[PDB]
Design a protein around this nucleic acid. Structure first.
Ligand SMILES: [Mg+2]
Ligand SMILES: [Mg+2]
Ligand SMILES: [Mg+2]
Ligand SMILES: [Mg+2]
Ligand SMILES: [Mg+2]
Ligand SMILES: [Mg+2]
Ligand SMILES: [Mg+2]
Ligand SMILES: [Mg+2]
Ligand SMILES: [Mg+2]
Ligand SMILES: [Mg+2]
Ligand SMILES: [Mg+2]
Ligand SMILES: [Mg+2]
Ligand SMILES: [Mg+2]
Ligand SMILES: [Mg+2]
Ligand SMILES: [Mg+2]
Ligand SMILES: [Mg+2]
Ligand SMILES: [Mg+2]
Ligand SMILES: [Mg+2]
Ligand SMILES: [Mg+2]
Ligand SMILES: [Mg+2]
Ligand SMILES: [Mg+2]
Ligand SMILES: [Mg+2]
Ligand SMILES: [Mg+2]
Ligand SMILES: [Mg+2]
Ligand SMILES: [Mg+2]
Ligand SMILES: [Mg+2]
Ligand SMILES: [Mg+2]
Ligand SMILES: [Mg+2]
Ligand SMILES: [Mg+2]
Ligand SMILES: [Mg+2]
Ligand SMILES: [Mg+2]
Ligand SMILES: [Mg+2]
Ligand SMILES: [Mg+2]
Ligand SMILES: [Mg+2]
Ligand SMILES: [Mg+2]
Ligand SMILES: [Mg+2]
Ligand SMILES: [Mg+2]
Ligand SMILES: [Mg+2]
Ligand SMILES: [Mg+2]
Ligand SMILES: [Mg+2]
Ligand SMILES: [Mg+2]
Ligand SMILES: [Mg+2]
Ligand SMILES: [Mg+2]
Ligand SMILES: [Mg+2]
Ligand SMILES: [Mg+2]
Lengths: 48, 86, 136, 55, 116, 208
RNA sequence: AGAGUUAAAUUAUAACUAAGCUGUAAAAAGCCCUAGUUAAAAUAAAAUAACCCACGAAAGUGACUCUAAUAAUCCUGACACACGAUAGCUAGGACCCAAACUGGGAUUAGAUACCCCACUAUGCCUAGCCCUAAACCCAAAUAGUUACAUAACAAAACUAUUCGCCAGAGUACUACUCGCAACUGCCUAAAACUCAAAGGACUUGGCGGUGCUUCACAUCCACCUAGAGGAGCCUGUUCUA
């Protein structure tokens, strides 16, 4: 409901996130600082 | 604990107002359903007791979305009526 | 684009309170438990400069859980920390409890400054089995 | 013409509603088969019950 | 987006096995849930314990501190004004939505059809 | 309550009516007042437009009454204002010029200063939780506390004087000792505040 | 089904700091070889993704990677054959956490419980059993159709081919039998006796120490005033006389 992807692409995104985390490509507990300023895909507005 | 500290769930005050900051924070942790999970992991819940909660929550969200939906779709006809006292 | 909250460990950013980098500013560890709140202000080098509890504050088994006692440990903690010369604090709140907001305003109320608020709450990704729920 | 809220027993119970004895419409004509809650309008069923033709 | 109602429930046609077990049938009900009245907090506590500090240090002479007291009574007056205003505030609703009555006439204009 | 809801209260003050021409919203207000055909209450017999009545004195007087005697209470109040007045004369004529600048010989401002000083700031209400009654700190509205002070004064001087001691004398004593904060009335006020502090945590029990 | 791997947490155990820490509606007990912070393996368990609806015959299966791998040119089918959650048994390991039990503490007329504190078998791995669940989606399998049609409710109503099962209620997941690595077990399963019912759904009330809204105006709480219950005496009951 946020990303807005098909089932396939969501599942691949997720399997991918996990696989990037345990092998050591990506941090688990936060977004990497470098990428905080990237383009914004999602529909979440945190700050109001 | 093995990740770099202070990068996780951090918000820094701007213009010295602490209260509003803590508010933004709690809004976040609530956005992700972290508060929920904390209050939930205070105690255990057996798996049965869990699937019950799941289904209930889902039915409730369906009814909600639907209700909100008929509400907002009907929002047009709530204006002052044309034909009154025919 | 002003005051983006997460200052990076990289040196790309220069912002100084009391001249010190964000990394040099002494921490305040606030544990808020359903039954208690205890504040410890520590150096960036992790040597404790202050410790104050609701039970070290003059309260007892029940009311020590309350928010009044949280702002109360807040003030005396901020004063014993002030005496050793700490102006600023970046805060980390361990636990979701009665004394969270109360002690966090209670620090600034005892004449201490707050800059960062982060949350370190234990969040099992499914580690240990928590104790049984209570009605049973 | 009856264009208005339709009192439930109008055709079914005429003598009490309309008068001590009364003659009833020989022909009903509907410009809509619905009432504002989108149900079949009563008078369909009622006329049908009352041996009256309807157009 | 609405969570799919496809294949979830237990029916005689269903090849799969139940996802959702509904407590009550899922139908949009004609009425709407009424306004849920909010609870109260403990108001003015800050000036309360501020003045408690003021008294435990001053040996309980009120004359020693005029200020804490006055801010405490200004706070109590703010809370009373807040209670009267929250009583006459019934026009509140959700502010951008409608009060439950108007919703209910609105829906009893366009009901949902279980029957026929 | 022989009056319907229709009957508005009498405004007994002479000064409001005598000087109408400088106020716009007030001219509008008492115009809307008497133009509406408002049935207006018969003004009370106890209240008078007299320049010598203080509704504070009025209510302490009333609160001191027993049975149907307005007379006996009006007299005991006369004798108390009298005892305070003449006693302040006795303290004034035995003193030195500095203290002849300091001392207050007005029993009226001594009364208002005896009640303003005796007034407890917070007061306790019992709340039932988990089967226990806790006394919790409550912020109080002005009038309740006014009542509190007056009642305490009356109660004390009815209670703790010896049988030869007259009422107005004792009340003059406690009025004067309340002026300077050293009488048992402010002791009750201070025990109110001490008990208000010991339990202050429980103020989180307060839902209003 | 293997083989390897570990992200957050927890804990050993050290170093600083504080004397308290834990716990409930409220308290005690308990621990102060305790708590906070900083460090850290082993075991266990697998946030979020999931508002998804895949896989497996069912039980089941949602941390990571790879190897092996999902019967049948496909109707039905047993007491035969192979499976089967939890708990349980046997032997060998494991033990952060949880926890029957037991022991303290409260709660109480009592509390063998609800509430707190410990702590064990026990959940975990390897081999072997035990073969039971509300093992339920209480809806048999395989073709079909939406034609006829509403006992009631609920998952609308039916044909066709099957296989399993049901002859009042108890007695009874019982007594006897047979078989089974069980020997307080499982399976299969009666009768004497007793009753005139037992049951499914439903309707109206009444009630609910259920939830929600709005109230009580001398009225429940908060608040105001004056009394009763103690004394003498008047008068009415109740016992004795
Ligand atoms: Mg650590
Ligand atoms: Mg780790
Ligand atoms: Mg969820
Ligand atoms: Mg999980
Ligand atoms: Mg049970
Ligand atoms: Mg399947
Ligand atoms: Mg149900
Ligand atoms: Mg294995
Ligand atoms: Mg540790
Ligand atoms: Mg509690
Ligand atoms: Mg003890
Ligand atoms: Mg989930
Ligand atoms: Mg599923
Ligand atoms: Mg293969
Ligand atoms: Mg196959
Ligand atoms: Mg098949
Ligand atoms: Mg077959
Ligand atoms: Mg088994
Ligand atoms: Mg076992
Ligand atoms: Mg063993
Ligand atoms: Mg063990
Ligand atoms: Mg070990
Ligand atoms: Mg343990
Ligand atoms: Mg016991
Ligand atoms: Mg009892
Ligand atoms: Mg109970
Ligand atoms: Mg242990
Ligand atoms: Mg197992
Ligand atoms: Mg099952
Ligand atoms: Mg079921
Ligand atoms: Mg199932
Ligand atoms: Mg069955
Ligand atoms: Mg049955
Ligand atoms: Mg079959
Ligand atoms: Mg057919
Ligand atoms: Mg019927
Ligand atoms: Mg039989
Ligand atoms: Mg059985
Ligand atoms: Mg048997
Ligand atoms: Mg056999
Ligand atoms: Mg009464
Ligand atoms: Mg009553
Ligand atoms: Mg009496
Ligand atoms: Mg008596
Ligand atoms: Mg007799």
């Amino acid at each position: 409901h946020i990303t807005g992807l098909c089932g396939k692409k969501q599942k691949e995104i997720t399997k991918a996130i996990k696989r990037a985390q345990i092998l050591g490509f990506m941090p688990v507990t936060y977004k990497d600082p470098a990428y905080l300023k990237d383009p914004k895909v999602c529909n979440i507005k945190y700050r109001e | 604990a093995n990740h770099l500290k202070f990068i996780a769930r951090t918000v820094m005050v701007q213009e010295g107002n602490v209260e509003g900051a803590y508010r933004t924070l709690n809004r976040i942790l609530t956005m992700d359903g972290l508060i929920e999970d904390i209050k939930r992991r205070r105690y255990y819940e057996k798996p049965c007791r869990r699937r019950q909660r799941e289904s209930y929550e889902t039915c409730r969200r369906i009814y909600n979305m639907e209700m909100a939906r008929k509400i907002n779709f009907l929002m047009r006809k709530n204006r002052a009526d044309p034909w009154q006292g025919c | 684009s002003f005051s983006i909250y997460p200052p990076i460990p990289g040196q790309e950013n220069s912002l100084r309170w009391a001249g010190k980098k964000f990394e040099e500013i002494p921490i305040a560890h606030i544990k808020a438990s359903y039954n208690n709140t205890q504040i410890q202000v520590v150096s960036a080098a992790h040597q404790p400069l202050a410790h104050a509890s609701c039970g070290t504050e003059g309260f007892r088994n029940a009311k020590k859980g309350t928010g009044i006692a949280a702002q109360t440990a807040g003030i005396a903690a901020a004063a014993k920390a002030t005496g050793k010369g700490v102006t600023h604090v970046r805060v980390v709140v361990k636990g979701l409890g009665p004394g969270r907001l109360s002690a966090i305003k209670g620090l600034t109320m005892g004449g201490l400054e707050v800059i960062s608020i982060t949350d370190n709450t234990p969040i099992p990704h499914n580690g240990c089995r928590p104790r049984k729920a209570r009605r049973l | 013409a009856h264009t208005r809220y339709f009192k439930g027993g109008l055709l079914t119970n005429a003598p009490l509603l309309l008068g001590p004895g009364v003659r009833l419409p020989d022909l009903i004509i509907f410009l809509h088969t619905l009432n504002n809650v989108f149900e079949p309008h009563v008078a369909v069923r009622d006329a049908a019950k009352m041996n009256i033709p309807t157009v | 987006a609405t969570p799919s109602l496809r294949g979830r429930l237990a029916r005689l046609g269903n090849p799969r096995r139940p996802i959702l077990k509904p407590n009550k049938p899922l139908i949009l009900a004609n009425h709407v849930g009424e306004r849920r009245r909010e609870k109260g907090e403990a108001t003015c506590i800050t000036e309360m314990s501020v003045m408690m500090a003021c008294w435990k240090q001053n040996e309980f002479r009120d004359e020693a501190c005029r200020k804490e007291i006055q801010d405490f009574f200004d706070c109590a007056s703010r809370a009373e004004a807040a209670r009267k205003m929250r009583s006459i505030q019934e026009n509140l609703g959700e502010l951008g939505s409608l009060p439950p009555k108007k919703l209910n006439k609105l829906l009893h204009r366009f009901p949902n059809k279980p029957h026929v | 309550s022989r009056y319907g809801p229709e009957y508005k209260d009498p405004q007994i003050d002479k000064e409001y009516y005598r000087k109408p021409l400088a106020e716009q919203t007030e001219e509008e207000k008492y115009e809307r007042d008497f133009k509406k055909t408002q049935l207006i209450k018969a003004a009370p017999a106890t209240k008078t437009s007299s320049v010598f009545e203080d509704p504070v004195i009025s209510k302490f007087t009333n609160m001191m009454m027993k049975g149907g005697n307005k007379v006996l209470a009006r007299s005991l109040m006369t004798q108390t204002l009298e005892a305070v007045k003449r006693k302040q004369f006795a303290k004034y004529h035995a003193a030195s010029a500095e203290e002849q600048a300091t001392i207050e010989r007005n029993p009226y401002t001594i009364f208002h200063q005896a009640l303003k000083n005796c007034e407890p700031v917070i007061g306790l209400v019992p709340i039932l939780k988990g089967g226990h009654f806790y006394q919790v700190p409550v912020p109080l509205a002005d009038r309740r506390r006014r009542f509190l002070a007056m009642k305490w004064m009356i109660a004390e001087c009815r209670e703790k004087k010896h049988r030869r001691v007259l009422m107005p004398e004792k009340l003059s004593q406690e009025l004067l000792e309340a002026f300077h904060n050293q009488g048992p009335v402010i002791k009750r006020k201070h025990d109110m505040h001490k008990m208000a502090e010991a339990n202050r945590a429980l103020a989180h029990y307060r839902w209003w």
